[PDB]
Amino acid sequence: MSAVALPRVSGGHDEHGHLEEFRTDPIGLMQRVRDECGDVGTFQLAGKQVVLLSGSHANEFFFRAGDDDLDQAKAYPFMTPIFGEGVVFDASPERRKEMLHNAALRGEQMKGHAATIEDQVRRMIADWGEAGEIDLLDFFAELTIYTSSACLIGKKFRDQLDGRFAKLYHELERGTDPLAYVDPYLPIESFRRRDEARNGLVALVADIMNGRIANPPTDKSDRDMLDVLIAVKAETGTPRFSADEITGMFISMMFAGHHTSSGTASWTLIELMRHRDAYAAVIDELDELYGDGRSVSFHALRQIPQLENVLKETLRLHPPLIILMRVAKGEFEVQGHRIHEGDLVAASPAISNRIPEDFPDPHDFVPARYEQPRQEDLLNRWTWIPFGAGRHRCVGAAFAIMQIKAIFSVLLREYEFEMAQPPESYRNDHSKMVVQLAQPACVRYRRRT
Ligand code: HEM
Numbered sequence: 001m002s003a004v005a006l007p008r009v010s011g012g013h014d015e016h017g018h019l020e021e022f023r024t025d026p027i028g029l030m031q032r033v034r035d036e037c038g039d040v041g042t043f044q045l046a047g048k049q050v051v052l053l054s055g056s057h058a059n060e061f062f063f064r065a066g067d068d069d070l071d072q073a074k075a076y077p078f079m080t081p082i083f084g085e086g087v088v089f090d091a092s093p094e095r096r097k098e099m100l101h102n103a104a105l106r107g108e109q110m111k112g113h114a115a116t117i118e119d120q121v122r123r124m125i126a127d128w129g130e131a132g133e134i135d136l137l138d139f140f141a142e143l144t145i146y147t148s149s150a151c152l153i154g155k156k157f158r159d160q161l162d163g164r165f166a167k168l169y170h171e172l173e174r175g176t177d178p179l180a181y182v183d184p185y186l187p188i189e190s191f192r193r194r195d196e197a198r199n200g201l202v203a204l205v206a207d208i209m210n211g212r213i214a215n216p217p218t219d220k221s222d223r224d225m226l227d228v229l230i231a232v233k234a235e236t237g238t239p240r241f242s243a244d245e246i247t248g249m250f251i252s253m254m255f256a257g258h259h260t261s262s263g264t265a266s267w268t269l270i271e272l273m274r275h276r277d278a279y280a281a282v283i284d285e286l287d288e289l290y291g292d293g294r295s296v297s298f299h300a301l302r303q304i305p306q307l308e309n310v311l312k313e314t315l316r317l318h319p320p321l322i323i324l325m326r327v328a329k330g331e332f333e334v335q336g337h338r339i340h341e342g343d344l345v346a347a348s349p350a351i352s353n354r355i356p357e358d359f360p361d362p363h364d365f366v367p368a369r370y371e372q373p374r375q376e377d378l379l380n381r382w383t384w385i386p387f388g389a390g391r392h393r394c395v396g397a398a399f400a401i402m403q404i405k406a407i408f409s410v411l412l413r414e415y416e417f418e419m420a421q422p423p424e425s426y427r428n429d430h431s432k433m434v435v436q437l438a439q440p441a442c443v444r445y446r447r448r449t
């Protein structure tokens with residue numbers, strides 16, 4: 001005969017099975033898989049079967065699985081066109097990923113990054129005046145382009161960037177419609193805007209490169225990563241790297257941290273405004289903490305409990321990545337259910353972070369869950385997964401947390417924020433593999449004191 005069918009969730013009778021629903025309501029769909037199927041259930045994503053695992057036992061299998069068992073490498077095909085075919089530092093598949101963020105993520109670099117991040121925020125709110133309104137996506141998306149580029153590539157580089165880079169990068173991120181699992185190069189409008197956006201980014205970098213070659217003045221110093229790549233010559237004296245190759249690398253370096261930090265910063269603010277009591281606790285803590293006269297570069301690397309717990313709760317309720325993917329490289333049994341090589345295996349932070357048994361009143365904002373006595377994040381090692389877990393746990397976790405600390409250490413002490421629309425109107429756009437805060441997301445601010 002053949003192989004036993006795995007539990008399959010209801011619906012999925014559209015052109016690409018469950019793909020359409022995954023686009024309009026991925027969380028509702030993934031939740032229905034768990035409700036109907038249990039810890040192991042499936043849904044059809046175009047021609048691919050997704051084995052969605054949930055619960056502590058199945059998640060453990062998922063996160064502890066080695067690269068040889070559940071391959072993460074080709075589990076996110078929507079990234080292929082974004083990163084590009086460009087090749088700067090040719091090395092192993094694991095090497096390439098390391099080179100992207102390892103250097104800048106060094107602990108010894110953290111202090112500097114916090115100072116850089118503080119500078120980026122003050123610069124971003126420099127023209128805010130006494131009072132006004134902003135849109136969280138516009139503000140945070142752009143801000144994080146500045147923090148990401150300045151920290152990962154260099155300050156000199158960020159100083160040559162402006163809103164254009166952010167607008168284009170945003171289009172890049174929107175070029176991740178689920179249809180990417182069919183083919184990331186399909187004749188889709190979003191995919192075309194993606195390719196065009198990328199081309200626009202390459203052009204912005206080419207302009208910078210040209211500008212630097214013509215006029216490189218300064219104290220003959222401050223030379224950043226772009227300067228080094230520009231100066232690299234091939235054996236004949238010709239520049240070795242094109243603007244595309246360089247841009248492709250820069251894009252790759254700041255991608256992971258951009259959509260995540262932008263959305264997480266937005267939701268942190270949203271949850272603080274939604275819960276004035278937590279907001280007030282954070283302010284008191286911030287004013288009291290910085291009362292020692294130490295800098296953000298000092299405090300952002302150290303304990304700021306109230307804010308951190310708000311952040312953790314914000315991440316539990318609004319995990320930037322609502323689904324994690326792998327490609328099975330063999331057969332494995334998980335609770336009597338068999339996974340076959342070629343199967344897309346997934347885990348969902350969106351779903352797992354709200355399992356009723358692991359997180360009392362999973363739908364409520366309770367930063368106290370992470371307080372010393374409770375520590376629900378640490379106790380549920382396989383289900384509190386905003387940063388994933390196991391072998392592929394987010395290597396940028398420390399940086400991201402420090403960044404949030406740094407950003408709000410400035411924002412919450414300079415301005416007071418209030419929602420300019422109904423608290424329930426703030427929502428995410430889950431139509432793309434890369435979750436983005438949906439607009440409008442209007443917020444009012446006013447100088448404190
Ligand atoms: C609070 C914001 C962030 C969240 C919620 C987050 C979340 C995650 C999650 C859930 C994973 C696991 C993916 C998988 O299992 O396939 C992951 C992986 C990863 N993240 Fe993040 N991340 C954040 C920020 C960052 C930043 C800022 C960087 C770069 C400095 C980064 C770099 C990475 C890398 C390189 C991996 C792959 C690790 C590996 O496969 O070994 N992340 N992240």
Ligand SMILES: c1ccc(-c2cnc[nH]2)cc1
Nearest residue numbers: 076079255256257260394
């Ligand atoms: C595809 C897979 C993972 C990521 C990511 C990791 N950390 C933040 N985003 C972004 C795209």
